[PDB]
């Protein structure tokens, strides 16, 4: 179910979107991971994309702590689905959560075969 | 308030994102239009984005026909608040919505200074 | 260099890309307005894209004088050539050009069937 | 053509546009990694962009094998001596190149604070 470590607060979702029918990119896998000290990605959290193209639960607020985040969206499998022939073999985005900054992260990406677009939606409030 | 023609259906949503700050367009006016058959631009729906840059209730299904229809989005008014100097005088979206193709429309935009993207999410359920 | 109607130090030019297939956009039609004295469209200038997806030619520093232009780019024939439905009906580009000096303007759009970005690179000319 | 380690035809290439400031992003911080045969990713070249936002002669020919590539753009850098907190840490593009037949790949990003595009355009060489 398109959730991962922390069925709550939901301080960082992921959406998806297909830039090719117009349509959410659902059953996208994504991994999130957490920098490590030994500056090596440790799994954080992972799931499959919903029907709308989102993932929340991915992690809890106590969780989440200050630190260097990647969340890699398995793209190539999902346009190999679509019998769509890729370039990239994932798309990434590594950032830095901190504390003083807004409280929530959506992370947006649309994906073309060749292109792929990503943003950062990052806010105090709810949706 | 953030709503048009129709606080109903919501068979037509727009989104506007800040890709400066990283936030939604708070504000910012659209006008959506519909094309008549001398071909002119007859007004239809207009509203300012709301505090998550969203606008709803611009239309209502039975309004809603199939036609050829412009969103126009005042970024340079936006950009101008922010004392950002701009390059478009606005962003446009003009597409033909059809009764055969899926039910919601939900018309994305991401907005730079020199640059904006937009995309079109159309699909049949809710959100 | 080239006055008259052709470019001089090609002071406009647009560059076209396919999101799709990882190459530039060939045979784009491209239709360049300029706004009138009685706020109306002018056609100033059209085109199509070579096989590099670019435009050059279209004016010449001495009549590209301050205004406000449009550039349309015809998407939708594009994409409908290739055997896809795409949701817009172009893409349209408008902005002032040349109110403070005359610059050198160069007009990128990446397309996809329900996506498009578009970016303007702004050049002060010299030699 | 120029081989050894140099652009015999610039089978890479990187260009990198500003979307803030209508510009070429300029002086920005390239690394290339090659993923080594113990599932590693090692160095394989660098460099600094342009005036014209470009970086070329990143490798040649004879040396850009068969294998999966990472181009690591330096972003957070770059918005940082504008005076701009950025998003992400950096922007990265991975890829498998070359696996039936030499291509001429050609990577552009385009960069905001909080949001990046990535394209690539594939050229199949000739003369």
């Known amino acids: 179910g398109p959730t991962g470590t922390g069925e709550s607060k939901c301080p960082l979702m992921v959406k998806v979107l297909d830039a090719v029918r117009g349509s959410p990119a659902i059953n996208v ?3 999130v991971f957490r920098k490590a000290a030994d500056d090596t ?3 954080f959290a ?3 994309t919903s029907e709308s193209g989102e993932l929340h639960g ?3 607020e106590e ?3 200050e630190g260097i985040y990647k969340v890699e969206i398995d793209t190539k499998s999902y346009w190999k689905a679509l019998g769509i022939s890729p370039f990239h073999e ?3 985005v590594v950032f830095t959560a901190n504390d003083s900054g807004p409280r929530r992260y959506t992370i947006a990406a649309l994906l073309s075969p060749y292109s792929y677009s990503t943003m950062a939606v990052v806010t105090n409030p709810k949706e």
């Open 41 to 43: 990605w440790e799994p």
């Open 29 to 31: 896998a994504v991994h």
């Open 58 to 60: 991915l992690t809890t």
């Open 63 to 65: 969780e989440f702590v």
């Open 46 to 48: 992972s799931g499959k």
């Open 90 to 92: 994932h798309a990434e």
